[PDB]
Amino acid sequence: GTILIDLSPDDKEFQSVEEEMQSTVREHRDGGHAGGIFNRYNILKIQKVCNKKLWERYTHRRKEVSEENHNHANERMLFHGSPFVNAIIHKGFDERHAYIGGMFGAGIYFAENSSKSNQYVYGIGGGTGCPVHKDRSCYICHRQLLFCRVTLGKSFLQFSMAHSPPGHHSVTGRPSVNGLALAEYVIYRGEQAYPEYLITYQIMRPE
Numbered sequence: 001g002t003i004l005i006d007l008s009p010d011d012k013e014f015q016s017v018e019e020e021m022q023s024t025v026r027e028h029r030d031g032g033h034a035g036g037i038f039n040r041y042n043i044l045k046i047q048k049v050c051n052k053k054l055w056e057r058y059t060h061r062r063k064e065v066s067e068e069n070h071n072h073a074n075e076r077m078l079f080h081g082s083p084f085v086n087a088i089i090h091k092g093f094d095e096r097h098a099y100i101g102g103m104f105g106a107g108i109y110f111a112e113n114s115s116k117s118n119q120y121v122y123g124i125g126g127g128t129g130c131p132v133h134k135d136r137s138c139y140i141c142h143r144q145l146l147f148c149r150v151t152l153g154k155s156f157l158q159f160s161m162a163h164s165p166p167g168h169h170s171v172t173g174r175p176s177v178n179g180l181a182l183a184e185y186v187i188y189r190g191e192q193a194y195p196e197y198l199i200t201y202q203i204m205r206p207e
């Protein structure tokens with residue numbers, strides 16, 4: 001049921017998605033080990049992901065959360081990187097996309113920093129890197145990220161599939177050492193995220 005629609009680079013919607021991608025790159029404490037060494041991306045394509053069934057699944061859960069939280073879904077746009085991006089956009093988020101060993105428990109993880117999600121494109125810790133060259137810092141191979149609509153509801157703040165903490169709908173991982181890191185978030189129900197944009201890109205080698 002999924003259709004992908006290409007956005008033109010001249011479309012303001014392409015341009016606002018690209019700007020969120022580029023502007024939320026940061027340096028990482030692994031010195032690039034997981035995701036590669038770069039300061040910016042070459043964006044190759046941005047597609048809108050359309051699936052009526054998955055969208056309705058998302059909005060149904062969104063209303064349930066809103067009604068549990070004084071009519072406030074606390075909806076964000078967040079990045080998600082995964083070797084399973086193709087199953088996600090076709091069949092939706094579920095248990096198979098959860099991070100069993102995650103430091104906030106076995107939920108599905110999202111990030112404000114696109115470069116954090118980039119570290120997961122080839123798996124946990126960047127796995128063995130790109131399939132072609134076995135390079136976590138490959139500048140040639142095309143990578144993909146999702147830019148997702150996520151319902152946080154009442155989020156449990158951690159300074160630093162399972163269930164979220166009693167009385168909450170998500171967990172927020174607040175950056176507490178690295179003053180430049182943005183927040184990361186975890187949801188415990190696949191229905192609390194919708195993959196809105198599929199972004200195809202390369203990381204760029206700094207000059």
Ligand SMILES: O=c1[nH]c2cc(Br)ccc2n2cccc12
Pocket residue numbers: 079080081082097098099109110111116117118120124184
């Ligand atoms: O975009 C992300 N994808 C992930 C995929 C797996 Br699988 C495990 C963890 C993350 N993760 C943690 C922070 C951000 C992300």
Ligand SMILES: [Zn+2]
Pocket residue numbers: 130131132133134135138139140141
């Ligand atoms: Zn490669």
